[PDB]
Amino acid sequence: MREAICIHIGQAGCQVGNACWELFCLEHGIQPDGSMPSDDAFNTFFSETGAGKHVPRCLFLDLEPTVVDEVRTGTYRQLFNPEQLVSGKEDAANNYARGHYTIGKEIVDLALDRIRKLADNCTGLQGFMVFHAVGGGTGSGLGALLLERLSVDYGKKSKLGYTVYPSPQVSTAVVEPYNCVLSTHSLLEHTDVATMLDNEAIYDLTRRSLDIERPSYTNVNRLIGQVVSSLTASLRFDGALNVDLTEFQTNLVPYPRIHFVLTSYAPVVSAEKAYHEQLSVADITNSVFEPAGMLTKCDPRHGKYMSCCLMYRGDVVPKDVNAAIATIKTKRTIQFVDWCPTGFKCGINYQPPTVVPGGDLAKVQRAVCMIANSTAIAEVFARIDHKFDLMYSKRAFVHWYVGEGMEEGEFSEAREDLAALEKDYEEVGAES
Amino acid sequence: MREAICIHIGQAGCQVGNACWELFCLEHGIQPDGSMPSDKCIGVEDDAFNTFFSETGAGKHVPRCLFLDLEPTVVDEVRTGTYRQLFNPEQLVSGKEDAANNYARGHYTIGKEIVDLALDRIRKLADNCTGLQGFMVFHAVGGGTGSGLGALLLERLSVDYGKKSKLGYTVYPSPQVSTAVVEPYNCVLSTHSLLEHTDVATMLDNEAIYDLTRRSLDIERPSYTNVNRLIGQVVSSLTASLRFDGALNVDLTEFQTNLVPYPRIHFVLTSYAPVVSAEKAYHEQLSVADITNSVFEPAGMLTKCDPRHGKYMSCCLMYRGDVVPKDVNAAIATIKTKRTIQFVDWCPTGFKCGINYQPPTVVPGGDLAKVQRAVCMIANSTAIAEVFARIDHKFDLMYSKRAFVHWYVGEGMEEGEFSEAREDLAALEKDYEEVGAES
Amino acid sequence: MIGGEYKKERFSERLTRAQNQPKNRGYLPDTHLKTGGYGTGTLMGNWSEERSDAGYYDGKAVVASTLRPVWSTTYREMVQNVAAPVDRCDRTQFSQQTFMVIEDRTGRSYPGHQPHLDPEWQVSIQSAHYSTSHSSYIHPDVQLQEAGGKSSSQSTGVLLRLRRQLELAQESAFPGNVIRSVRNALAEACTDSKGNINTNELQEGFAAAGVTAVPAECVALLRNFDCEGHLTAPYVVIVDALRGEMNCRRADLVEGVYDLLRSFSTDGVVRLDKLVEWVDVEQLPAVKSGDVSADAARTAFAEQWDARSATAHISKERFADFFADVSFEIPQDNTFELLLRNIWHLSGGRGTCENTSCRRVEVVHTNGRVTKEEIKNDLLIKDNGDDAAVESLLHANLAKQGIKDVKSVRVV
Amino acid sequence: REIVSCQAGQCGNQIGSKFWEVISDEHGVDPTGTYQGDSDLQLERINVYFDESSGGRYVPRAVLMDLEPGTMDSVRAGPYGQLFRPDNFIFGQSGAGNNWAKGHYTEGAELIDSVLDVCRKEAESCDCLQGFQLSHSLGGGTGSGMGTLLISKLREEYPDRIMMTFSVIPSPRVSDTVVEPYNTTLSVHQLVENSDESMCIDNEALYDICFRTLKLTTPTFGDLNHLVAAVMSGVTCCLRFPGQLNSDLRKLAVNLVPFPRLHFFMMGFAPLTSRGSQQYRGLSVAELTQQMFDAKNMMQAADPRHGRYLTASALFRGRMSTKEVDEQMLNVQNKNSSYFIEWIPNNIKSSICDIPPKGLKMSVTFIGNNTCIQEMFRRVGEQFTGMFRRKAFLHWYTGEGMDEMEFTEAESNMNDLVSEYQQYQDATV
Ligand SMILES: Nc1nc2c(ncn2[C@@H]2O[C@H](COP(=O)(O)OP(=O)(O)OP(=O)(O)O)[C@@H](O)[C@H]2O)c(=O)[nH]1
Ligand SMILES: Nc1nc2c(ncn2[C@@H]2O[C@H](COP(=O)(O)OP(=O)(O)OP(=O)(O)O)[C@@H](O)[C@H]2O)c(=O)[nH]1
Ligand SMILES: Nc1nc2c(ncn2[C@@H]2O[C@H](COP(=O)(O)OP(=O)(O)O)[C@@H](O)[C@H]2O)c(=O)[nH]1
Ligand SMILES: [Mg+2]
Ligand SMILES: [Mg+2]
């Protein structure tokens, strides 16, 4: 029961999965072989076999084989299924057209077959969680294709896209705004909740809260996996206020088109500083709501919050979270929209957040992750469309798309989708 | 952090830098290969060497010092010497031809073809430092290159780094015995540049140190090696307050602001105690008061300028070893009661004392005796007017009927520069007298 | 390197009539590497960069006659003090294999590369053997397993590391065996009469005691603690530094215990036989739990007292050090105070550290008043088998304390 | 993902021989073709550049083209000569005379049938051909003529595959032929139309690097080819080795080609330290990035400061963190906004590969699309037109079969490319 199927698309998704699956294995006591040396809670992320092994409900997809072969030769080779770990032969080259038109259909059928096998195995499938990067080709192309096929094949199943976006100034691609603006078309219609996972905010969090001189994708993906585990632990473990996928779906999405959400996590402290500060529920809530303690480069003080969901883990108390809510509401720096008087969905889980050894998080008795739908998120679109327009004025880097089966107009539908995506956020944020 | 960049200019600067860098390597346990032994690193990753040495990815330590001499002999022989592995092929710049006791040649013809790359090397030395405290220019105003190229480099450093701390240990011509005949010309010409672009100028004339090592260190016939080792010991005593912790620590700016009362008054006499060999030391009780009295006496000074006919303005004391603040206070009280030396009326305190827990280390094969404690006294005093009057009277005799001026005017210098420098030094005499005058 | 064989013309070049081009090796006449138009000896232009090459042979013989040995200069005679004497970047230790590889200029990433002169080549190759994700995602068990400016700072860091390693090793009928065995191992490793130990003796002393010490570790220890300047220091100061300075509270307790023992001494002098007769070893945690017997506890007590005679004299320093070992290996001040007070019947302490060894007595006075009193300092008042004698001793102690109106005493 | 390489002319053959030496050093392959690599990563993706035989010998997917048999004689006499197959060597009888007409119309054309046969044999042997590699010199006759003919043909027989061509541009300072402008002009218009990416190497810049960047007393053509081989392997390291930011030929082409006619790139390699300063210059990402954008480090003779960067690609190799390499690109974009185009945000594509060059801690190859590329074409423009004014050496080309029209067509296409670079050099938003 309460099974959720994890899907990873592109290199970014593959690394995010390779960083969250060892966290899940540590949480549920699963060795890389897939056994417990020395209670049904792993069923959400692991499928039981009569031999005692626990195969994850994970799909790995990438048009290029380097990352999947690294996974196949890694420590978790005996854990991961040889199938559902699929590979292509030529990458998308950050070409949404290549990933969605030419190379997409030759692997999408296999991907849907493996997802069908996973869903058949899952007898209580709660939904799908897809990890990809909109800035890439496979993340945008194969991401859009898989989103469309899953939406047309599985009805109204909950779908959570924990997706990485082009950061405001630290980005590693030039056609990346093109890929983002093109993937938005799928991420509006076929995605139930999308979670912003840019890289600059993670970098700043690591450099200003962990004092790590040289952190990298290993650290950022460990933090992403920690956020995902914090969000999903509500159903895998008991708690005072458990939540379900559809439950916070309803609590978070006010309108069908308003589903892009900021994310934040606390207390993210080092081992040296773990045993010094007073890491109470109120303190961690304040750290959560601080602009610098989140996972996306989007300052909420320029916008207005619409719905905040607070997943507390450990020995947290409902009155502690109530006091945190009261202090937050009294605090005027953050603004709540006028038509949402409550605006808070808090859940409590009794399982403390496990820390993977050798990482940056330190073993802390309690933590909290916030998923916030807010009007401030219009800024990421307002800058990504500006970046897209600076190249689309005379459309550089578009012959690559055109030669891969892309019509010239698809960019125009991308631009109109961005326009409407900013406009409905402005409308909902406008005072009555 | 707390890095300090050494810049050695001229032949005298090169030898003084060789001596002080040998001393620094011995103090920090750095072999000529440039790598500290496993003993000196296994305890903790001490940051003591950081100010003078920068670590590399292989654990090797490279000095933060730019050698810069126009003629190639001294820098070339340093490259050929044992410290080849210790120094970089860069950062050790050698020119093509010397100025030859010609400030005009070193500042207008040969200086410019090397100053650009000198500043580029200084940039590559400074961007490495994250907490650079300042620069320390080691040179002699007597030499043509050390005067001219030193002045040009100081000007460029000032205009590029703004108000950064800038010490200069400079060897002025001795009042009585000197080598060059154009040395007074070079000194007078470079004095203007020192005034304009030097935060503190430390006096390092030759004959005073020679007499000091003749009478105190008992070396009857010391060569340049011994005087350079003494200068290096003085520099190490001055700069150890930040490398090693102490009861009262000072940095590049504290003694700067405590010894510079006025922007133009920044020329400081130096003295070191106890400069004792292995023989006169074991008979004497080297106490804090004893070494303080010795370093305040004119016999123990490193510059041929007795303070009895001068007027003290501010003395900075650097104590090294097992020195106690209460012993320092007793020494200060004894000095204040003593009437043979008198402080200026408007500066009652006049003392800036700082203690460090690192006793001075004697170089193997040297002549200084390894002592428990030592003191280095840097005095800003009006007595420097005496040596400056000596040098500008010498310059006036030189310039009475235009001697050795064709060499300078043939290297691209106007004749009025000599008059400008002479009037600048005359105004310096005037302001020394003014600050020494009782209110 | 000596000789310069790798610069000499090889057999392949003779057998194929090979020449200076394209492999500029310089073995043939008129093929030397002229930089500036002059040899590597006439150092002009690119000379320093040329000499920095790994396959560079200086050309100076290693044996010189002593009949014209006067050509040194001032810098040479100043730096001869630090110059190394002459017999993985040692060109002298390099073999002809690596030298001819360097001459052939193979296995280089870019022209002018010096893999052999690079000292981190081995670790670079080992790192290149692994990927970032593979090294990041090592199996959790072995991954969890892999987790100032003073002259004495490095040595005090050494002492801290050794102390924490001894604490981890700890985590013995009577306490003190850790420092006891460390001192015994150092004493055994000694070969000098007055207690002076060199680096190798110190290293193998730690090895016998159960401490992993690097030769550099030992050399740092001896260089800090040396006073005669022979890279040799007494072992007592090293052991005391490893044990650490005594805490104020525990030192005060030890002083009180010694004062009590001195007062209880028959002749006013603390003696080993009275010490071991007065110690109540029955109240150790191990003895209470039944791990060890009282006889074994007393035997160990004497054994790490290390007294050369059964009637030896115990003084200030001896008592302080003996219980300082116990203080070092017991981490909690409260439990150390409780254990010491329990062993030596010192009345006092507050709360958890309050002494429980002394016999509480219900005393009825001449007026019938019943009071629950605590006897103080009852080391010699033991079960001698005579109830009348014990009762009289209790009355004498109470009278000395100040309660003189007693009429009956019962031990609670 | 297989890349098959072909080397035209003496220059191309020697550069490719050095490239295969570098590749075999990276992959642990002897001249005998056997394997000694101590790491599984050296053998996991050996199929990109090598094919295993029945005996297991790893033979490179390489084709060799030069009219003179002496080039193949030297190639075999090289230390890694036997690594190649015998049937990939296709050589004519007489030399090209350094005539583009001879190498492209009469002798090279009659020779290229077997070249196409063996190239398509290698293509069919490849499971999924990633791309075609060319190493050639445009100043020569056989390197330029046969190279242009082969890339032209391979464009039709393989339209969707990558065309990565390393062209050695002649320049007046290292000019050693009078028909260099003729050959360069007659080759540039095939390169512009039959190459997905055509990056340039100039002997002036190579000698400058060997003189003042490496300070080497006397390197040779071997060491120039060694630098070119290092960058040659660095441009495709991401295919054969894992990394945090995987990349390949199309990955680089998409990010570096804004418009189809703009596919000529600079070339650079870091670190490049003199052997006297190797032990002293600490290797770090910041130092690498500082060396990347320096004009002297660029193997392109044209000064990049004059031009404005269309795009750039930074293929880093070794274990390093990600923001310590991305924030460097941020700095070079922010503090040098004048040298980068405004209407292109984030001009630098960056990728990271896990395995550094053998024994190095880290390295990086820099491939930059800049408006300074047009300087070579302009200078060869006046060099070509001055000769073409009065029939200078033109009679050889005319009598070999070429006509008067094609020379002006070539110079007109080159002028069109130069104008394309101009109109973006001073472009405004
Ligand atoms: N959080 C995280 N982001 C990554 C990681 N690796 C790459 N990214 C980001 O993801 C973006 C593109 O991801 P992908 O969808 O895999 O695109 P790609 O890496 O080019 O792979 P292809 O689409 O197949 O070409 C890049 O611009 C990176 O900024 C990672 O390991 N962790
Ligand atoms: N203390 C000290 N002073 C020196 C030393 N060498 C030279 N001098 C002084 O420097 C003065 C002349 O300058 P030099 O150092 O000899 O030469 P230079 O400064 O490099 O100038 P050039 O002659 O042009 O090269 C002499 O009068 C000496 O007093 C030295 O090794 N130690
Ligand atoms: N970098 C490099 N350049 C070379 C090499 N051999 C020749 N060249 C260049 O190629 C130019 C002449 O090319 P050419 O020999 O006519 O080419 P070919 O006709 O194909 O053999 C000269 O200007 C050289 O600079 C080499 O091994 N390396
Ligand atoms: Mg990819
Ligand atoms: Mg000189």
Q: What is the DSSP string of B374-398?
A: EEEEEEEETTHHHHHHHHHHHHHHH
Helix, strand, coil abundance in chain B, percent, nearest 5: 45, 15, 40
Q: Which two tokens stand for residue B317?
A: 């004391």
Q: Which chain D residues contact residue C119 at CB under 8 A? A: 279
H helical segments located in D158-209: 180-193, 203-208
Phi, psi (5° rounding) for residue A397?
60, 30
Give how far the C-alpha of residue A430 lies from the chain's centroid of Cα atoms, to the nearest Å: 28
Instruction: Count Cα atoms within 13 angstroms, Cβ side, for B122.
Output: 24
Kindly state the DSSP code that residue B173 receives in the 8-state scheme.
P
Residues C101, C4: contact at Cβ < 8 Å? no
- B18 in contact with ligand 2, CB cutoff 6 A: no
The shortest C-alpha distance from A13 to chain C (Å) reads: 14
Q: Which chain B residues contact residue D282 at CB under 8 A? A: 56-57
- B228 in contact with ligand 2, CB cutoff 6 A: yes
Beta strands in C175-329 (DSSP E): 196-197, 233-234
Chain B partners (3+ C-beta pairs within 8 A): C, D
Give how far the C-alpha of residue B52 lies from the chain's centroid of Cα atoms, to the nearest Å: 16
The shortest C-alpha distance from C10 to chain A (Å) reads: 46
Distance B194 CA to ligand 5 centre (A): 20
- Give me the torsion for CA of C390, C394, C395, C401, rounded to 10°: 160
Cα–Cα distance between D214 and D226 in angstroms, integer? 13
> Position C156: which residue type?
T
Cα–Cα distance between A345 and A370 in angstroms, integer? 10
Strand order in the sheet with D162-169: D89-90, D62-65, D2-8, D129-137, D162-169, D197-202, D264-265
Kindly state the DSSP code that residue D131 receives in the 8-state scheme.
E
* B191-B194-B200 Cα angle (round to 5): 130
Cα–Cα distance between B16 and A238 in angstroms, integer? 75
Answer whether C133 sits within 8 Å of A70, measured CB to CB: yes
Q: What is the DSSP string of C196-227?
A: EE-HHHHHHHHHHHT----HHHHHHHHHHH-S
Cα–Cα distance between A81 and A72 in angstroms, integer? 9
Of all protein residues, whose CA lies closest to atom 17 belonging to ligand 1? A136
Residue A70 Cα distances to A10, A369, B266, angstroms? 13, 31, 66
Beta-carbon contacts of C156 under 8 Å, excluding residues fewer than 6 positions away, are B43, C150
D282 touches chain C (CB under 8 A): no
Place of tokens 């990276």: D26
Residue B387 Cα distances to A36, B303, D3, angstroms? 88, 9, 79
Q: Which chain B residues contact residue D280 at CB under 8 A? A: 56, 60, 62, 88-90
Phi, psi (5° rounding) for residue C234?
-65, 150
Residues D75, D64: contact at Cβ < 8 Å? yes
Beta-carbon contacts of A26 under 8 Å, excluding residues fewer than 6 positions away, are A354, A356, C140
Looking at the DSSP bridge assignments, the partners of residue D318 are D362
Q: Which atom of ligand 2 is nearest to the CA of B13?
A: 15
Q: What is the DSSP string of B400-420?
A: TTT-S-HHHHTTT--THHHHH
CA nearest B128: which of B198, B197, B52, B59? B52
Phi, psi (5° rounding) for residue D70?
-60, -30
CA nearest B14: which of B158, B169, B135? B169
CA nearest B259: which of B167, B335, B196, B155? B167
Answer whether C107 sits within 8 Å of D25, measured CB to CB: yes
Cα–Cα distance between D137 and D144 in angstroms, integer? 6
Distance A90 CA to ligand 4 centre (A): 9
Q: Answer positive or negative: Cα dihedral of A337, A340, A342, A348.
A: negative
Answer whether D226 sits within 8 Å of C111, measured CB to CB: yes
| Residue in D322, D340, D344 to test binding to A, most A beta-carbons within 10 Å | D322
- B15 in contact with ligand 2, CB cutoff 6 A: yes
- B144 in contact with ligand 2, CB cutoff 6 A: yes
Answer whether A94 sits within 8 Å of D254, measured CB to CB: yes
Residue D246 Cα distances to A15, C290, D140, D242, D250, angstroms? 12, 65, 36, 7, 12
Q: Answer positive or negative: Cα dihedral of A253, A258, A260, A264.
A: negative
Residues B327, B360: contact at Cβ < 8 Å? no
User: How many beta carbons lie within 10 A of that of residue D43, not counting itself?
Assistant: 15
Looking at the DSSP bridge assignments, the partners of residue C326 are none
Cα–Cα distance between B339 and A327 in angstroms, integer? 71
CA nearest D424: which of D308, D327, D294? D308
Cα–Cα distance between B353 and B376 in angstroms, integer? 10
The shortest C-alpha distance from A192 to chain D (Å) reads: 29
Kindly state the DSSP code that residue B188 receives in the 8-state scheme.
H
Cα–Cα distance between B277 and B216 in angstroms, integer? 8
Looking at the DSSP bridge assignments, the partners of residue C372 are C362
D335 touches chain A (CB under 8 A): no
Residues D111, D72: contact at Cβ < 8 Å? no
Secondary structure of residue B4 in the 3-state scheme: strand
CA nearest D33: which of D84, D89, D87, D77? D84
Residues C276, C302: contact at Cβ < 8 Å? yes
Cα–Cα distance between B415 and B275 in angstroms, integer? 45
Q: What is the 3-state secondary structure (H, E, C) of D39-108?
A: CCHHHHCHHHCEEECCCCCEEECEEEECCCHHHHHHHHHCCCHHHCCCCCEECCCCCCCCCHHHHHHHHH
Residues in chain B: 439
What is the longest distance spanned by two Cα atoms in chain D? 62
Interface of D with A in 211-240 (CB under 8 A): 238
Residues in chain D: 429
Cα–Cα distance between A378 and A53 in angstroms, integer? 45
Distance A170 CA to ligand 4 centre (A): 19
Closest to C109 (Cβ–Cβ): which among D214, D230, D274? D230
Cα–Cα distance between C328 and C336 in angstroms, integer? 10
CA nearest A13: which of A66, A67, A57? A67
Distance D326 CA to ligand 1 centre (A): 14
Catalytic residues of B: 254
- Give me the torsion for CA of D27, D30, D34, D40, rounded to 10°: -20
Residues B121, B135: contact at Cβ < 8 Å? no
Cα–Cα distance between D45 and C57 in angstroms, integer? 42
Q: Which atom of ligand 1 is nearest to the CA of A167?
A: 29
Answer whether A169 sits within 8 Å of D320, measured CB to CB: no
Q: What is the 3-state secondary structure (H, E, C) of B419-438?
A: HHHHHHHHHHHHHHHHHHCC
C127 touches chain A (CB under 8 A): no
Closest to A18 (Cβ–Cβ): which among C133, C138, C144? C133
Residues with CB under 5 A from ligand 5 (ion): B 11, 71, 98
Cα–Cα distance between D1 and D240 in angstroms, integer? 9
Experimental method: cryo-EM
Instruction: Indicate the pairing of strand B61-63 with strand B200-203.
Output: unpaired
Residues A414, A182: contact at Cβ < 8 Å? yes
Kindly state the DSSP code that residue B277 receives in the 8-state scheme.
-
Q: What is the 3-state secondary structure (H, E, C) of chain A?
A: CCCEEEEEEHHHHHHHHHHHHHHHHHHCCCCCCCCCCCCCCHHHCEEECCCCCEEECEEEECCCCHHHHHHHCCHHHCCCCCCCECCCCCCCCCCHHHHHHHCCHHHHHHHHHHHHHHHHHCCCCCEEEEEEECCCHHHHHHHHHHHHHHHHHCCCCEEEEEEECCCCCCCCCCCHHHHHHHHHHHHHHCCCEEEECCCHHHHHHHHHHCCCCCCCHHHHHHHHHHHHHHHHHHHHCCCCECCCHHHHHHHHCCECCECEEEEEEECCCCHHHHCCCCCCHHHHHHHHHCHHHECCCCCHHHCCEEEEEEEEEECCCHHHHHHHHHHHHHCCCCCECCCCCCCEEEEEECCCCCCCCCCCCCCCCEEEEEEEEEHHHHHHHHHHHHHHHHHHCCCCCCHHHHCCCCCCCHHHHHHHHHHHHHHHHHHHHCCC
User: How many beta carbons lie within 10 A of that of residue A164, not counting itself?
Assistant: 25
Closest to A70 (Cβ–Cβ): which among C131, C138, C144? C131
D176 touches chain C (CB under 8 A): no
Give how far the C-alpha of residue D311 lies from the chain's centroid of Cα atoms, to the nearest Å: 17
Cα–Cα distance between A386 and A180 in angstroms, integer? 12
Looking at the DSSP bridge assignments, the partners of residue B378 are B270, B316
Place of tokens 């390295």: D363
Residue C219 Cα distances to C193, C224, C231, C293, D330, angstroms? 20, 9, 7, 42, 48
> Position D212: which residue type?
R
Q: Which two tokens stand for residue A54?
A: 């626990």
- B22 in contact with ligand 2, CB cutoff 6 A: no
Distance B73 CA to ligand 5 centre (A): 8
Cα–Cα distance between C4 and A191 in angstroms, integer? 74
Cα–Cα distance between C214 and C287 in angstroms, integer? 38
Beta-carbon contacts of B193 under 8 Å, excluding residues fewer than 6 positions away, are B150, B151, B154, B155
Cα–Cα distance between C221 and C218 in angstroms, integer? 5
Cα–Cα distance between D46 and B40 in angstroms, integer? 46
Residue from D64, D150, D168 whose mutation best tests the ligand 3 pocket (most atoms within 8 A of CB): D168
CA nearest B31: which of B113, B86, B91? B86
| Residue in B55, B90, B91, B123 to test binding to D, most D beta-carbons within 10 Å | B90
Q: Which residues of B224-247 are buried (b: 16+ CB within 10 A; e: fewer)?
A: bbbbbbbbbbbbbbbbbbbbbbbe
Cα–Cα distance between C234 and B243 in angstroms, integer? 30
Residues A140, A17: contact at Cβ < 8 Å? no
Closest to D128 (Cβ–Cβ): which among A89, A176, A399? A89
Q: What is the 3-state secondary structure (H, E, C) of D312-349?
A: EEEEEEECCCCHHHHHHHHHHHHCCHHHECCCCCCCEE
Instruction: Indicate the pairing of strand D129-137 with strand D89-90.
Output: unpaired
Resolution in A: 2.9
Cis status of the peptide bond prior to D242, with omega within 30 of 0: no
Closest to C117 (Cβ–Cβ): which among D216, D223, D279? D279
Residues C93, B33: contact at Cβ < 8 Å? no
Cα–Cα distance between B156 and A275 in angstroms, integer? 51
Secondary structure of residue C409 in the 3-state scheme: strand
Answer whether A76 sits within 8 Å of C137, measured CB to CB: yes
Secondary structure of residue B140 in the 3-state scheme: strand
Cα–Cα distance between B208 and B227 in angstroms, integer? 10
Beta-carbon contacts of A397 under 8 Å, excluding residues fewer than 6 positions away, are A174, A175, A178, A391, D254, D257, D258
Kindly state the DSSP code that residue C334 receives in the 8-state scheme.
H
User: How many beta carbons lie within 10 A of that of residue D412, not counting itself?
Assistant: 12
Cα–Cα distance between B414 and C96 in angstroms, integer? 63
> Position D299: which residue type?
M
Residues C408, C364: contact at Cβ < 8 Å? yes
Cα–Cα distance between A193 and A190 in angstroms, integer? 9
Phi, psi (5° rounding) for residue B426?
-65, -40
Instruction: Indicate the pairing of strand D197-202 with strand D162-169.
Output: parallel
Instruction: Indicate the pairing of strand C196-197 with strand C233-234.
Output: antiparallel
